[PDB]
Amino acid sequence: HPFHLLYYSKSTCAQTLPEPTFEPVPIQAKTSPVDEKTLRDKLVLATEKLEAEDRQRAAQVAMIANFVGFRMYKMLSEARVASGAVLSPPALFGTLVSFYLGSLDPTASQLQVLLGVPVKEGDCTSRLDGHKVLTALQAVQGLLVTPLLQSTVVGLFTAPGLRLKQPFVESLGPFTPAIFPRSLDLSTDPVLAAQKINRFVQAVTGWKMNLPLEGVSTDSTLFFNTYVHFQGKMRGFSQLTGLHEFWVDNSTSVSVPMLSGTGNFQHWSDAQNNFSVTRVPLGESVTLLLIQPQCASDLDRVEVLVFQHDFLTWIKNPPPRAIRLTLPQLEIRGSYNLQDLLAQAKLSTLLGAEANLGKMGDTNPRVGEVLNSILLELQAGEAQQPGSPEVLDVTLSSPFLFAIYERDSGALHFLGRVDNPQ
Template identity: 70%
Template structure:
């Protein structure tokens, strides 16, 4: 844990400095008071633990059991409705969680990008990653709970109840963040975004899960699917069954499905997220266009193009340009274009580790004709691998205490995050009208490797960070 403490030390200090601004008077306010247990909640917890019998448990049904396909339109409507009656505390809580997941997301993106070459793509969802870890925190007991809390960005100061993260509040804030992303635009406006999160809890036969834990996951993953199957006899067959099951339930094609299941695992914790965004006023160009993977190699890809007034900034000192395109009322797509093909690695380090939020302040409106690839990106990564790179290989290992998930012999195997991200043209509504320009709109064409981020403005939460090295390749 010490190594992680060093690597995330600056994160914690920044979080404390920012949140500490709330304590303007001399009365101490816990910097995360909206996310930790209140004194009354602690008293209630102490009382209920003395009076309440063991939590109800259940055994997941076999994986062959039929399940209705995911209704993504219904999920979007539920998310959007969740934002209609937000209180000020809800928005403040979402902003704090947004900041926490951004810090963790940048940190883990660096781990992920360092594990692959710049010639390959990278996509990470900080919101999904944070939600997965917060879900496991909901099921953890000390010392695992304390270690997870610190890794999420909240020091447990005196180990007292009022310094402990309330996992339900954190997942509720994530629900708000997800809802803000897909919120309808304007009076009667319709969002063009889809965001669907599905959680698969795959257990060894006979392992019993605690009902309060599974019910508590609903704010983050409204579709949670506990299923049992033999993970030990034939791990490859188990992986194949999981892949077929998730394909049938979601209809999403994941190019890197589950593989390499450890035979001694008793629980696989797999989060699947689908995002679909449409760029208003953009149209699909006829035929295929060249995208230069490097100076000597190109691939033919579908491209989309649109003209409007977008936020833009060109930084000659750091050899990059930024263009921000609205996706919905609250959601934005930020495109980061290195000026030279050889600048990608340097620009990636600057953008996603140091200056991202600062650079947003430099953007100004500009009439632009933007051309970029139509994207269908698929990615999958095991959080266990990222934790090992972060010097925390045992955080969710064999000794992890996850007693709120199950009282049985629980051994967590893979903790998978799988992403399907789509960006395409929406030829209906036009973007903001461009002001007349003497020389016409600025031409911005992303025909070489570039970076992107999708974020929500109210909470500033980053939903996706990525590198597009080849629009046709699997991440």
């Protein structure tokens, strides 16, 4: 199970300045919108110059991100339902890696164990190098997007008067260049602060993120909010004009626009547990997995059996075949406070009251919430002969599961349940 490339190397661990701090500008300050095209350009350049070692490193980080992602999705299912769910294991993994990059001895060893990596109480070369991990995680993001958009902006919101340490904020660079430290009152009122954060995110990203705060604290001095926007314009598929019936529940249904494409996709059906997968290539390495249960009356049971478990043995590689796949256009919006998922795993004090985060600023900050908000989009992008006698149509017109997988890293990037696509 070596994670050798993630640990501190003897040369770096073999290696003082008083940390210079700064105060974020007010969250109301006018800010240039984010250019998602620029975020792709850089990510690509990041991939193109990867060495063999760097790809090996990305492979290791993917395993963990996947494993943690499964453990977190287990928590997320229990928390709750009508919309369904979406989780992004890398975005979620790098969020914790950031907190590790700002933590000290007690929390530093803990967060590392939460992230899966073993620690030796005394050894320095058994501790995670956060910078290596984040760059390795930047390799994973890059391999996903080489048409496919993956923007991740981080909103680092601070209570006014709290100064952040410059070295820390820099550390998080590989994770994303779209990090935004901003200051607001987190103790005046939670709803008012909530609308300030939303007003800012909307402004810069452009993405409307329908985010209900599941209440909020009034003694917080630091929010950490990761905002992912995947957009997959899928080749072969095209919009069908007019809406079409999707089956939501035993007594209710809705008519929504579907995209559709013929092609040589991989499709099979698991007999052991009564479901069927449909595998669509989004690109040269990316694959969209679509799982539909034999009957929608045990989608909960299949989900527990496929996602929640670490094994992707249920994933297979049989021969391609002519299939006319039909599925809804996706505007999946998800949002979850990671603090609540840790509470579900009974790790409330991990990033809670006594969490040692001394590297983050001049004063040890009280963390408010740790949001991850997704906008996952599948759309028409711009094969055998139309109406070939060998075309079995797989059609997803009722609750189904999805996952996005990248072969080089082995990274599961996105996964979730679609109970209703509006």
